Write a protein that binds this ligand. Structure first.
Ligand code: OLC
Ligand code: MYS
Ligand code: MYS
Ligand code: NA
Ligand code: SR
Ligand code: SR
Length: 297
């Protein structure tokens, strides 16, 4: 049957749509509770939660002797977060970046370049261990700098945590349904293609970031969007790629890493010397479009 594919697909969108808004709302509240910025909650809790698909996908693929899918998924997500996710969000809600957030973005940049350089001959399991350690350090460093918490069964907090978790479950399940529904529609229309079907789940892992960021964008939560983008990329590299490399050596993806380094560099330069708004967003989307037009499938 195919309506099951249609049912799923539509339901996936509904869970994604409402799930994303609840995730954003709950995350914004949690940040106020812990006295940290929206960037910080976006870069830690939101980034890790929405990167769970990438982490499972890369670990699974490398385990199943498909390390090309594992690194392809990780870095492709990174390119998607800056090009598509941040591109759309910048246009919706232009961001002027604070001096301290610029420091966080510069560190992100350094991290990406380091990853690109040690991955020129691919990524070994020791490359993995190192990247994962830097990931852990980035998280502690980010929270520390974004913290002002100097000081308990509060209904405000509990309600905040419930919005967040149910929202997350909503976007993660919604995303799966979207992919699963699309897969079944494709199969019973007999238009299924593996080469393209890998980019259905590849894009699939990026749907949480997309919807969550757009939801944050609609509520002018610019720092949260930026936090979620920066953190998700780091989680995709220090987490998804890294764990992949633990099961098997990952072949180099130098062209894609170069594209990521160029987009990351652009993202930093705009954050430091300008803004992340309309035309910066238009630039990110144009670059993203060119990438999905010309990069190897
Ligand atoms: C502020 C500067 C930040 C850093 C800018 C990049 C600096 C390091 C470049 C190359 C060596 C890295 C050595 C340590 C990490 C790799 C350990 C390793 O196993 O290296 C072999 C390599 O992966 C091949 O197989
Ligand atoms: C001579 C090197 C052989 C390496 C064989 C594979 C080792 C994989 C280790 C994977 C797990 C690393 C976990 C860190 C928490
Ligand atoms: C064949 C296409 C190769 C890539 C053309 C675009 C390169 C990047 C251009 C960025 C500015 C537009
Ligand atoms: Na993420
Ligand atoms: Sr993701
Ligand atoms: Sr290497």
């Amino acid at each position: 049957m195919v309506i099951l594919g249609v049912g799923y697909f539509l339901l996936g969108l509904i869970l994604l749509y409402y799930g994303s808004d609840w995730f954003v709302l709950g995350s914004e509240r949690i940040a106020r509770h812990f006295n940290v910025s929206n960037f910080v909650i976006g870069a830690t809790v939101m980034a890790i939660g929405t990167s769970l698909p990438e982490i499972l996908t890369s670990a699974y693929a490398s385990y199943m002797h498909a390390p090309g899918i594992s690194i392809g998924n990780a870095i492709g997500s990174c390119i998607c977060n800056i090009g598509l996710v941040l591109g759309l969000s910048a246009i919706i809600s232009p961001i002027i970046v604070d001096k301290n957030l610029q420091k966080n973005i510069l560190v992100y940049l350094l991290f990406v370049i380091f990853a690109a350089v040690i991955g020129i001959d691919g990524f070994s399991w020791i490359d993995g261990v190192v990247l994962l350690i830097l990931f852990i350090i980035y998280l502690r460093w980010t929270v520390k700098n974004g913290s002002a918490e100097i000081e308990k069964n509060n209904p405000s907090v509990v309600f905040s945590l419930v919005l967040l978790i149910i929202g997350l479950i909503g976007v993660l399940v919604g995303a799966e349904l979207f992919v699963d529904g699309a897969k079944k529609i494709a199969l019973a229309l007999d238009i299924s293609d593996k080469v393209i079907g890998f980019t259905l789940v590849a894009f699939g892992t990026s749907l949480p970031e997309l919807m969550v960021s757009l939801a944050a964008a609609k509520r002018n939560l610019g720092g949260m969007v930026l936090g979620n983008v920066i953190g998700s990329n780091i989680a995709d590299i220090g987490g998804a790629l890294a764990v992949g490399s633990l099961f098997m050596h990952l072949p180099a993806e130098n062209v894609q890493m170069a594209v990521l380094v160029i987009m990351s560099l652009l993202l930093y330069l705009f954050a430091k010397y300008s803004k992340i708004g309309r035309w910066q967003g238009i630039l990110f989307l144009a670059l993203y479009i060119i990438a999905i037009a010309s990069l190897r499938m």
